[model samples]
Structure formats: structure tokens, C-alpha cells
Target: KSVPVLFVTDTIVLPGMVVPIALDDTARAAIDAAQASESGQLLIAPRLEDRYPSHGVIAKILQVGRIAGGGTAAVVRGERRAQIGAGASGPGAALWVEVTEVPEAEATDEIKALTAEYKKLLLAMLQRREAWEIIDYVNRLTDPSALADTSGYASYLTNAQKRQLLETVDVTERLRVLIDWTSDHL
Candidate 1:
């Protein structure tokens, strides 16, 4: 499907992650178009220094309101991975992109084992930081893709690594990267 593109430079959004984005004029246009759409969805595209990654997250708008700091922002939850396609005309002043949904592979034994190891490493890191609530929340997740996607919230990960995670379609490979990256921090 085609969706308005909201280019994010500060951070990457991954499937199953919820994030609040501070809205600028560009963001406002994108969000407005998304709100007017039937799906209420937009492409959360990651912008590096000069270009965007080939992949983006299709997110549903949850709410729009002023943040505590008094800036207008929108809360969105990333739903699925999409391969960005050619540009298209869209409503408002936002850039639009054609996107194809990326299918996920089923979790195999290797994926499950990697998920367990990655969770262990993540829990240890969170424990040291004393983020008990997040630890409990992480422990509750069962899907391997969801578990791997939680790396989006790991602040220590670089934008490059996060983009790599977003671009990777295979669950086992994503978990492997997360395991190695998380292990590096511990």
C-alpha cells in the first residue's frame, strides 16, 4: 500500500515498538495525511546522513497531543516491516511512498534459542540500569520477532545498527545481530 512518509533522523522505529515523535511542519503534514487515511497508518522511514534505508515501519497513529515539554507530538506503534517503493503523490505537503509489506519467517529452534540468549543479555543490562518495569515487560514478550524488535529501545545501539535491524527480514539473523550487539554492551 502507499503511505505518507515521516522521515525520522533521531531514531529508528521497529515493529512492536511504540514511540512519540515531536512534530515539525513536515511531520505535521505527514501525520495529518495519515489521520485522514482509511488505515490511519504512515511509513516511519529512517534517515541517515544523506539517504533513507530501504525499509521502514508501518505504524498506526495512537494519539496526538502536546508533550509535557509543550511541543506537539504524536504517539505511534510500529506494526509491520515494509519495503519502500517508488514515490507517489499524497495528500497535504507530505512525501508519499509506495510500500510492499515484508513477510516474516516462522520462528525455528535456532530463533527461539537466540531469543532466550538475547533476552538474558537484555535483562542483565536492564537490571544493571535498575529498569525493573522494562525488565518485567521484556520478560512477558513471547514472539521472537517482537523480542528482537525490542532492540529499538536499546539506546546504546547506533543508528546504523538499528537500521540494519530494520532492514533485516530474517528473524534468526535479526536475533543473531541483537545477541552480538547486546553481548558487546555487557
Candidate 2:
């Protein structure tokens, strides 16, 4: 089934990684309502652009619960943008959304090159820092999408910058930013 698109900026929820995120009252209500629906399919797209109207990805919630301050938090799992379906909600506070999962896009030639460079940068950091455990962790997690996640480590940016990078669906551009960051740092 096809799903409607929702764009969010600054923060995107991802799969695999156990991210600590918070949701306001309005977002929390929407999530609660969606979880009660049939598919429970939700979209979580993160964007780097300062302004929103960004494209988000569809995903499933492995777990969701209340936060320390009486808000809400969830363990989100990135499924895919391609699989998202129609959204059943209004502006502000609403829910009952249906979504389709997105398939991981194949690497373009440029993406492949940039990824290779980023990989080298990552390996060098691992070797230099003697963070063999993280290297092993990266090597052990061998899927292509995992590789995209690994690119997140290729740079020497702050946690906030990395978070921004992690939010995008554009693989090649992220790879390039990572490559440049690594080249300058190492």
C-alpha cells in the first residue's frame, strides 16, 4: 500500500541505532494514535536544512514508552521510504497514519567512490585511535545500509553534526561530506 509523505527537519528517527529522542505533547499524541492503528506504519524523515518541508522515511516502532519527564520516547526502526502509504491525520495533533517501507537505494558510481574514500577515512581513524572494537563492530555489521551508517563515523564532526548527517536519505552527498571531513581531520 502507498503512504503519504511527511517531512521533518533536524531530527530523524533511525533503525538499528538506539537513539535517545524526545517528543512533545502533540507529537506524542500522534504516535500513540498511530500505534493503535492497523499498519502501525509511520514515517520518520530527518533533514539538515534549517527550514522544514523535508522528506522523511517510513518505519516501524519496535518499542515505545513514556519518558523521564512525562513525555514520550520510542525505539524506532527504519524500514523504508518506498513502502509508505496514506496518512490519516490533520495539521498539529493527529494520527492514524499508514506507511510503506522504503527500499535502500543502490549505490551510484559517485556514491560508490565517495563511500570508498569514506571507508578508508574510517579505517584510518580506527587504526589511529586503536578503536579496534568499533572497527570490528563496523566490519561485523556488513550490510550496505550498515555501511551507510558507518559513513557516519568517517568524519570528525561534533555529535550534533553527525546527527544532522544521519538524518538525510541522500547517500552520495552524505558520503562526500564524510570524505571531506575525514580528509581534513586526518
Candidate 3:
């Protein structure tokens, strides 16, 4: 289904992550229109100038808050991967984009093993950072597919690297790639 589009800045968004967006006029109007329509979801991706990656996530607005000075603040939950296509232009111009869903890839035995190893490394880093709650969450996450998506939050990775991880759909391959990345960082 066609939904509103949110152009992210400063960070990469992945499936299963909740992101907060400070909206400008275009985005504010976009979300408003979407809520009135059949879907409250939005296509999210990083953007600079007129360019944005083809890959992004389909996210739904969980909450909208008012800013102190007076603007729109929104919390959105990413549901799954999506392919972003040509979009509408200009401010308050009904920002819309064509999106196609990306199905989850199956996890294999090797992927599961790699997921375990990556989780250990992630937990170690989180422990060092004293993020106990996050450590607990990572420890409890057993799905290899979810592990791959969670890897986008790694601060050590560049946005390009995070985008690479986002583009990689094969769960097994993503797990291997994450293991290599973790090894390099550790």
C-alpha cells in the first residue's frame, strides 16, 4: 500500500526499531494525510538533498508529540524492509512514495551460530557501555533475522555500512557479514 514518506537524517533506520522524527511542514502534513487514509505507515530512509537510497523501511506512527517552541514530533515503529521508489517533491506537496515490501529471509544453522556469536559480542559492548537494559534485550533476542536488523544500531558502523546491512536481505549472509564486522570492531 502507498503510505506517507519520512526522510530521515543523521541515522539509519532498520526493521523493528522505533525512531523519533522532528517533522517539518512536509512531513507533518504527510503524516496527517496518511492517518486519514487507509494506512498510517510511512516509508523511511536517509536523505541528503534530492537523493535517498532505494532501500528503506515501512514504519507506522506510534505517537505524535508537540514541541516546546511549536512543531511536530513523532515516534514511529519500523515494521519491515521496503523498496522506496520515485516520490513527490516540494514542501507541503503531499510527500508520497511507491514502496514494495521485502520479505524476511530464512535463517539456517550457520546463520544461527553466527547470530549467537554476534549477540555475545554485542552484549559485551553493551556491558562495557553500561547499557544493562539493552544488554538484556540483546541477550533475550534469539532470532537470527532480528539480530541482523538490530545490527543497524551499532555505533561503530558508518551510515554506509548500516545501509549495506539494510540492503542485505539474506539472513545467513547478513549473519556472516555481521560476524566479520563485529570481529573487525572488537
Candidate 4:
């Protein structure tokens, strides 16, 4: 499928994350196109060195309104990963891109073990930071990929690391990388 592209500088959006993005000229154009489209979805790519990453997340616009300071922003939920392909013509002034959805691999025994370990470390870190409310939510996620994607909410992670997680499709590898990163925070 193809969708309007929203170029996010430095930061990355991961699957299963609900993020509010402030609208600029480019962002407004993209959101306008998405809202007009049939799917109401946009491809959110991280812009590094003035270029987009090969991978991006497909996000659905949940709401669009003014933020706290009266700045225009859109609340979007990242649905899944997509392989960004060649450019395409889109409606309005927004850039468009061809995308193929990236399929998630089924979790193996090793991945399950890693998920359990990562959850423990993550819970410890959350408790240390006094983020008690999110602990139950994290514990309830049984899927390894979903658990790994939760790292998007970790403020301690660098943008580059989050991008890496976004690109890593293999569930086992993603969990391993997340485990190492989460361990460092503990």
C-alpha cells in the first residue's frame, strides 16, 4: 500500500504507541492528505541526515486539535511496521511513498524467555522511576514483539536506538536488543 509520508526528525515512532505530533507546514500537509484519504493512515519515517529510513510505521490519526500551548497537533496510534518503497504522487502538498507491510515473526521459546527477563528488568526500572501505573500494562503484554515495542515509551532510550528497534523485524533479535538496552537502565 501507499500512504502520505510524515517525516519525523531524529525521533522514531514504534508499533503500538500512541504519540501526539505537533504539526508544522510539512506535517499539516501530510495530515491533510491522510484525513482526506480512505484509510486515514500515514507513513511516519524518521529523517536522519535529511533522508528517510528504509522502514517506517503506519499510523492512524486518532484526533487532531490544538495542544496545551494552542499549537496544532495530531494524536496518532502507530499500527504496524512498513517497508518504505519509492515515492509516489499524493494529494495536496504532502509527500507520498509506496509501502509494504512488514510481517511479524512468531515468538519462539528463546524469545519468550527473553521477554520474561526483559519484563522483569523493565518493571524494576519503572518502579525505580515511580511509574507504578504502567507496570500492569507492561505485564499484560504477552507478545514478544509488542513487549519490545514498548521501549518506544522509555525516555531513556536514544533516538537512534529506537530507530534500530523499529527496523529490526525479527522478534528474537528485537527482544534481545531490548533486553540489553533495558538491562543498562536498571
Candidate 5:
């Protein structure tokens, strides 16, 4: 689904996950536009200054409030992956984009094995990081796409790796890449 986009730095949001955006002038600008819209949704794309990926995840606006230090705070939940096609400057200095949904690849048996191994590696990483809550949550996820997307939380994942994960269309392949990443970190 096409929506207004929020460009971020050093952060990646994946489908079925929620993330907080520190509402600086740039983020608040996008939040304002999203609040005014009926959908109350926006795409979160990782950016480095003027450079951003052509794909991102569409997120639903969950909350918007004032935080300490005179900044705004908003929580958003990622709903799905989208390919951003065309864009233009929009309200409150937000960037609006034309989006198309990115389809999920069919999960084959081999993919399932990769996901299982990836999950094991991820659990080890989570244990080392002492993130028990995420470990518990990840323990219950069985879908290939879900497992792959949830790996966005790993601190060991570089921005480029996250971008590659987002751009990848095949769940099995994404799981494979994430498995390799988790192995290195573990």
C-alpha cells in the first residue's frame, strides 16, 4: 500500500514488528502528515541523509505523544513490505511515496530447515544478549517470513544487511542470509 514515508537513520523495521521512531523535526514532520491522513499509516525506510532504499515496510500509527526534551514520540507497527516507486515532498515536510506490496516467497521444505537452524542461532544470540523477552517471542514463531523479519532486532545486523533482508523476496533465502549473520554473531 502506498503511503507517506518516514526516512530514518540506523534503524530498520520489518513486517509484524513494532518500533519507536524518535520524533525529531524530520520524524515529527512525517507523523503530522500521517496523523492527518485517514489511514494513519506510513512507510519506514532507512535513510542516510539523502540516500534511502527503494523498499520499506508500511507501518500503522500506534501512538503519538510528547516526550522529554521537547521532542515527539510515536510507536509504529510494521504491517508489510512495499516497494517505493515514486515520491514527492508532502505535508509537514514528509515524503509521500507510491508503493507496491512485495510478495512473500513460498516456503519450501529446505527453507523450513534453514528457518529452524536460523532460529537456533538466533536464540543463542538472544541468550548472549540476555534479551529473554525476544527469545520467548521468537520461540513461538514458525513462519519463515516471520522468523526472517523478526531478525531485524539483532544488533549485529548492519544497515546494509537489513536493507538486503528487506529487499529479498524469498523467505527461504532471507532465512539463509540471516542464519549466516546469526552464526557470525553467535
Candidate 6:
């Protein structure tokens, strides 16, 4: 066993809700400390998705994680839910976390074919509205890696709506949001 994983200075665990935050000295320190202690094992907290961060994707640490002068920057993906815990100090300066990824089935248990239908409807909506930029974006999205942005149709939905979508493992149900989004926009 070891100490908990820390959020540290930035405390940046991107929320399922997209919001940017400015980091204070302590926040950065905490991240530095936590990263230093573990051998690539980091934890997230405050629980999202049912009990903990499920479907959380490991972030690509920036080549220039720290700024040229002295600050740090990160782009964490909140593609899933998490369980946040108490903040504490470690070797450097960071907040530790205890976490686990929730299964897809659990996330979309009640839903069905929503994600795919969402994609279809979304495509139709973009076509009808002539959101050429987004249409181009849809064209550019060909791999699984592109789902985040393509699926960002959920961005305009309500917080509760998003939560339900995230909690659903039924890819169909989740994708349905795309169709719903398309209809709503129309």
C-alpha cells in the first residue's frame, strides 16, 4: 500500500462539466508532490459517475508541462465520473486521491443505441443547420479518438442530462443524446 494520489497545485481534474480554472501556488505544488511520489500511479476524487471516476481517460502530460518561465499547464479529460477525497500534502505539494473506473455497462446500463443514434441525428442536424465547421469536424472524426469532440453534442445539454448520459452504459442511450441534440437544435 502507498499514500493517496494528489491533485496538488492545479487540482485540475476536469469536471464532466467543462470549466477552466486558474491554479494557485499550493495547487501546483500538490500536483508536483503527488507525481513525484508515485511511479505513474495517480488517483482522482470527489466521486463522479456512480461511486468513482468511471471511464476516466489517462491524460497526455504536456511536453512542456511547465511554462517557459515557471508555471504549469494541463488538459485533463473528464470523460467519466470520479470520487474526490480529502486533500493532503506529500513529498512535494499535491492532493492525493483514491479512485477506480466504472464499467461501461454500469455507465449505460439502462440506455440503448443512444450514442449511435445520437451520431446519426447529430449529423442530420448539422447538415440541416449548415454548421459547416461542425460538419467538417464530423468528417474529420473517423477514429474512436474523435468521439470526445464528435460526442460533444452533449455539451449543450443540461447538467442533469449530461449526468444521465454519462451514467448510461447503453451506448445507444448515450448516442440518443446526439439525436436529441440534433432535434433540439433544429
Note the Cα lDDT for every prediction shown: 0.87, 0.55, 0.75, 0.85, 0.82, 0.44
Alpha-carbon TM-score of each model against the true structure: 0.92, 0.66, 0.84, 0.94, 0.88, 0.52
**Candidate order by lDDT, highest to lowest?**
1, 4, 5, 3, 2, 6
- lDDT digits (tens) for residues 1-186 of candidate 1: 789989887778899899999998889899999998888889998874555568899999999999877789889999999998888677887788899989868768877888899899989988887999989988898788888877888888998899889989888888898888999863
lDDT of 2: 0.55
Q: Write candidate 4's Cα lDDT for 107-128 as tens digits.
A: 5778789889998998898887
Could you give candidate 3's per-residue lDDT for residues 46-127 as a string of tens digits?
7755575767788888999987777778888878888877776533456777788887666567777888888887777677
- Tens digit of lDDT per residue, candidate 6, span 76-142? 3444444333334455545455444444343343333444445566677777767878877775553
The RMSD (Cα, Å) of candidate 3 is: 2.7
User: How displaced is residue 173 in candidate 2, in Å?
Assistant: 2.8
Task: Highest TM-score: give the candidate number.
Answer: 4
* Candidate 1 TM-score, true structure as reference: 0.92
For 28-63, candidate 5 gives per-residue lDDT tens digits of 878888888888888888774565576888899898
List model 2 lDDT by residue over 62-97, tens digit each. 777787877767666665434333455543356334
Q: List pairs with backbone clashes in candidate 1.
A: none
Clashing pairs for model 5 are: none
Q: Which 10-residue window in model 4 sums to the lowest lDDT?
A: 45-54
Rank candidates by TM-score, best first. 4, 1, 5, 3, 2, 6
Top candidate (lDDT): 1
**TM-score of model number 5:** 0.88
Model 6: residue 60 alpha-carbon error in angstroms: 3.5
Candidate 3: stretches off by over 4 Å:
48-52, 68-70, 88-92
**Which 10-residue window in model 1 sums to the lowest lDDT?**
45-54
Q: RMSD for each model, in Å, please?
A: 1.7, 4.6, 2.7, 1.5, 2.1, 6.3
